Amino acid sequence: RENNTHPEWS
Amino acid sequence: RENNTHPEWS
Amino acid sequence: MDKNELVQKAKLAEQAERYDDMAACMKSVTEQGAELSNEERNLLSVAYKNVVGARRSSWRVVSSIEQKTEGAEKKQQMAREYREKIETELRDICNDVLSLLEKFLIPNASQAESKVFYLKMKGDYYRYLAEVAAGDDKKGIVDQSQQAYQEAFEISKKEMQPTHPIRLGLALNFSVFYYEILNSPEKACSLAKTAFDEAIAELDTLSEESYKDSTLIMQLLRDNLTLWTS
Amino acid sequence: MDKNELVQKAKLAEQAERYDDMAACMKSVTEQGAELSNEERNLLSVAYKNVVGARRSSWRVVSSIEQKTEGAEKKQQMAREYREKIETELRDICNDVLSLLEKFLIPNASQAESKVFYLKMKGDYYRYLAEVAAGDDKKGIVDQSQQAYQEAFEISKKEMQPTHPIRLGLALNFSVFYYEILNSPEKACSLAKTAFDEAIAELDTLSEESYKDSTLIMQLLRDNLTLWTSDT
């Protein structure tokens, strides 16, 4: 899957 | 809740 | 400036959810004058449905904010001016589609199916203009929508089987025009019920190419019916 | 009062999901030279995240299509040329933000919290450029991203509590930079595990205003770890 970054929701 | 039209996904 | 290349670029744009690009491609295809195939017709429809749908959605949010702001002059003036900016964008979009429909797609429609599809589209986009019209212009726009639908309706009842996905979708949107635009729940309900019931009685006529769209539209018809009667 | 009018218009845009308008309002606010408040900072952040996020997303879709069309010359060339068009948009956006950060936001950051926020932001947007760079410019772009994150990282460990969402978010993004851009999973994991464990050890420092963001970011850190530790 994808790598989590924050803030989210591209 | 709203009126369904076709095609959708507005 | 090759037709098949612009169509492939259009499906790339669609996969990238870049619907302005996708709409610009199929406007270019339409402007080349040739009758659209079923695939190109569908890509032109999906593109502009997404381009207009964003503005419609934005328009409803800003309209509701400007309704709820009745007592604060400076805030209402800003919500009003933004709603009118979105409104102008929405109209230019509809007028773009409706221009393509009168210059290219409707006069070139060889068979009833194409003719009913493009007349449905003409009713749809005048309906979107009706959603935001007020006063002077609203009467003529509503009638334009109605006359487009009605011709599509009459042609479809004479030439298309009741399970044809275009006939069903036309019934679905035409009913919503009667409900939301003409404010006649009676006609909306009967027109949706009839379409659902004549389709349900002939499901042996579904093809593998079209049964998915036809059965989805039927479900939407019944959901509109359930909503409108309660 | 033009600034407060521009701020109100930006929240109208956000309510309408018109993120180009939102970003243009808050660029105008930033360009007025005055240090941004936390509310303005966040709307500048939310706006450009959505405008850049759209292009990153489109970029990954078309990039995967051009990989899956190896051996189909005409389709792969079309995917490539479209991917390059998106990249040009993606680069102009990042360069737009990075100019605001260097011309206005970083030099005006009076407080430690503001400073690590904007330096995290500087690392993020160089990272988005890095995701898309190749060859000559990639080395320097990777370097700018790393240097921004590290400075942010050092300031945040010296001034912020281990549960502060800005400190935690910075650790989350810095770890992803090590994993995805520098291809160093061990360092990515260690930086994420350390940040998670230092938060867990001082949960008395959570504030009610931010504990929701703090606990979500902790969960995201541990999810990245769980993903990376089942591969590497």
The rounded Cα C139 to chain-centroid distance in angstroms is: 19
C-alpha–C-alpha distance, residues C10 and D161, integer Å: 50
Compute CA distances D90 → C205, D7, D118, D139, D176, whole Å: 49, 25, 20, 18, 20
Which SS3 state, helix, strand or coil, does residue A10 take?
A: coil
Tokens for D2, please give them.
């033009």
Question: d(Cα C170, Cα C182) in Å, to the nearest integer?
Answer: 16
Tell me if D8 and C58 make a contact (CB, 8 A cut-off): no
Q: What is the SS3 assignment for D27-72?
A: HHHHHCCCCCCHHHHHHHHHHHHHHHHHHHHHHHHHHHHHHCCCCC
Distance from CA of C62 to the nearest CA of D (A): 7
Contact D227 A5 (CB under 8 A): no
Contact C58 D86 (CB under 8 A): no
- Whether omega before D162 lies within 30 degrees of 0, making that bond cis, reads no
| B4: three-class secondary structure by DSSP | coil
**D58 with C5: Cβ contact below 8 A:** no
Q: Which amino acid makes up residue C57?
A: S
Q: Are A9 and D177 in contact (CB under 8 A)?
A: no
Nearest Cα to D178, choosing from D129, D125, D123? D123
Residues of B in contact with C46 (CB under 8 A): 7
The structure tokens listed for D114 are 């503001």
Chain C contacts in chain B segment 1-10 (CB below 8 A)? 1, 3-10
Q: CA-CA distance, D102 to D121, in Å (whole number)? A: 11
Q: Return d(Cα C20, Cα D149) in angstroms, integer.
A: 36
User: What's the rounded Cα separation, in Å, for the pair C189 and C174?
Assistant: 11
Interchain proximity D53–A5, CB inside 8 Å: no
Amino acid at D44: L
User: CB B3: neighbour CB atoms within 10 A?
Assistant: 17
Contact at CB, B3 and C180, closer than 8 angstroms? yes
* Structural domains in chain C (count): 1
Collapsing DSSP to helix, strand or coil, D205 comes out as: helix
- Closest residue on chain B to C170 (Cα): B6
**Nearest-CB residue to C16 (from D12, D58, D75):** D58
Q: CA of D64, closest CA in chain A: separation in Å? A: 14
CB contact under 8 A, D12 and C65: yes
| C172 CB within 8 Å of a chain B CB | yes
Structure-block tokens of residue C203: 């499901």
CA distance A5 to chain D (A): 5
The residue of chain C with its CA nearest to that of B6 is: C169
Q: How far is D193 from chain A (nearest CA, A)?
A: 14
Write the CB contacts of D77 (distance below 8 Å, at least 6 apart in sequence).
none
DSSP element (H, E) containing D221: helix D211-231
DSSP collapsed to 3 states, D127-172? HHHHCCCCCHHHHHHHHHHHHHHHHHHHHHHHHCCCCCHHHHHHHH
Q: Cβ atoms within 10 A of the Cβ of D72, count?
A: 12
User: How far from B6 is each of C40, C45, C141, D113, D160, CA to CA, in Å?
Assistant: 17, 10, 20, 50, 53
| Cβ atoms of D144 and D121 closer than 8 Å | no
> What is the rounded distance in angstroms from the CA atom of residue D144 to the CA atom of residue D159?
23
Chains A and B touch (3+ CB pairs under 8 A): no
Range of the domain at C211: 1-230
**At which residue do the structure tokens 């990039």 appear?**
D63
CA distance to D63, D71, D75, D195, per residue, from D68 (Å)? 9, 9, 10, 38
Contact C26, C43 (CB under 8 A): yes
- DSSP secondary structure letters along chain C: --HHHHHHHHHHHHHTT-HHHHHHHHHHHHHT-SPP-HHHHHHHHHHHHHHHHHHHHHHHHHHHHHHTTTT-HHHHHHHHHHHHHHHHHHHHHHHHHHHHIIIIIHHH--SHHHHHHHHHHHHHHHHHHHHH--THHHHHHHHHHHHHHHHHHHHHHHHS-TT-HHHHHHHHHHHHIIIIIS--HHHHHHHHHHHHHHHHTTGGG--TTTHHHHHHHHHHHHHHHHHHH-
| Cα–Cα distance, D145 to D119 (Å, whole number) | 9
CATH number for the domain harbouring residue C118: 1.20.190.20
Q: Is C46 on the interface with B (CB under 8 A)?
A: yes
The identity of residue C161, as a single letter, is Q
Instruction: Locate C15 and state its tokens.
Output: 């996969």
Instruction: Report the gap between the CA of B1 and the closest CA in chain C (Å).
Output: 8
Residues of D with CB under 8 A from a CB of C: 5, 8-9, 12-13, 15-18, 54, 57-58, 61-62, 65, 75, 78-79, 82, 86
Instruction: State the method.
Output: X-ray
Chains C and B touch (3+ CB pairs under 8 A): yes
Q: In whole angstroms, what is the distance from residue D38 CA to residue D122 CA?
A: 17
Q: Verify whether the Cβ–Cβ distance B3 to C224 is below 8 Å.
A: yes
**Closest partner CB to D217 (pick from A1, A6, A9):** A6
The angstrom resolution of this structure is 2.3
Subunit partners of chain A (3 or more CB pairs within 8 A): D
Chains C and D: 3 or more CB pairs within 8 Å of each other = yes
**CA-to-CA dists, residue D15 to C54, C61, D11, D90, angstroms:** 12, 7, 6, 24
Cα D21 versus chain centre, distance? 20
The residue behind tokens 């109208």 is D12
Within chain C, what is the greatest distance between any pair of CA atoms? 61
Distances from the Cα of C93 to the Cα of C18, C51, C63, C129, C209, angstroms: 16, 8, 19, 10, 31
